[PDB]
Design an enzyme around this catalytic site. Structure first.
Site, PDB file in Angstrom:
ATOM      1  CD  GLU A  35      33.638  60.015  -5.134  1.00  0.00           C
ATOM      2  OE1 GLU A  35      33.276  59.858  -6.325  1.00  0.00           O
ATOM      3  OE2 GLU A  35      34.586  60.667  -4.883  1.00  0.00           O
ATOM      4  CG  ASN A  46      38.518  58.295 -13.120  1.00  0.00           C
ATOM      5  OD1 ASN A  46      37.415  58.698 -12.733  1.00  0.00           O
ATOM      6  ND2 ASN A  46      39.282  57.523 -12.367  1.00  0.00           N
ATOM      7  CG  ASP A  48      43.289  59.916 -14.773  1.00  0.00           C
ATOM      8  OD1 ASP A  48      42.510  58.953 -14.901  1.00  0.00           O
ATOM      9  OD2 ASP A  48      43.744  60.168 -13.632  1.00  0.00           O
ATOM     10  CB  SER A  50      42.738  55.971 -13.689  1.00  0.00           C
ATOM     11  OG  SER A  50      42.014  57.113 -13.254  1.00  0.00           O
ATOM     12  CG  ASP A  52      37.167  57.003  -9.645  1.00  0.00           C
ATOM     13  OD1 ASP A  52      38.423  57.013  -9.661  1.00  0.00           O
ATOM     14  OD2 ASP A  52      36.423  58.037  -9.378  1.00  0.00           O
ATOM     15  CG  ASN A  59      42.516  56.938  -9.423  1.00  0.00           C
ATOM     16  OD1 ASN A  59      43.742  56.828  -9.384  1.00  0.00           O
ATOM     17  ND2 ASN A  59      41.867  57.058 -10.507  1.00  0.00           N
TER      18      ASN A  59
END
Ligand SMILES: */C(S)=N\c1ccc(-c2c3ccc(=O)cc-3oc3cc(O)ccc23)c(C(=O)O)c1
Length: 129
Positions: A35, A46, A48, A50, A52, A59
């Site tokens: 990650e 991200n 969408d 959002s 992280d 998120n």
């Protein structure tokens, strides 16, 4: 902070992730490697919209508040910036809620695609714990 592998393994053990929800320590270390490359300050926007945050790339649509993600639920009740600290407590506490949500560690796509079913104990091997 960028942790070395055994330093993060020992911190994650100290913070109670070893065998949390049944996931041995190496699963958490492997997930953090893929990650964030063990960097608490990692952020990634991200698709969408959002973002992280942190060592486990948690998120802002579901888990933390960053003030810029429409629909945010902030289910860990923390600012996303808390997930970037050299102190991994907030990341660990929120990860404990995430892994308890129903799908276990499959909530981290990187764990499913890169860690699940592999020899995760290799990530702890050699470490004083
Ligand atoms: C990095 S390499 N390793 C590392 C460095 C510092 C900490 C840690 C603590 C460790 C043991 C404690 O009893 C309390 C700790 O408090 C911390 C507080 C802040 O703000 C940052 C780091 C702290 C760890 C770790 O949490 O295990 C690991």
């Amino acid at each position: 902070k960028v942790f070395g592998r055994c330093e993060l393994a020992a911190a994650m053990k100290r913070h109670g992730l070893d065998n949390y929800r049944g996931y041995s320590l190496g699963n958490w270390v492997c997930a953090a490697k893929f990650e964030s490359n063990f960097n608490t300050q990692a952020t990634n926007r991200n698709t969408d919209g959002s973002t992280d945050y942190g060592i486990l790339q948690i998120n802002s649509r579901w888990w933390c508040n960053d003030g810029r993600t429409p629909g945010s639920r902030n289910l860990c009740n923390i600012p996303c910036s808390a997930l970037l600290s050299s102190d991994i407590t907030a990341s660990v506490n929120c990860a404990k809620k995430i892994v308890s949500d129903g799908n276990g560690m499959n909530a981290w796509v990187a764990w499913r695609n890169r860690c699940k079913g592999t020899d995760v104990q290799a990530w702890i091997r050699g470490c004083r714990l």
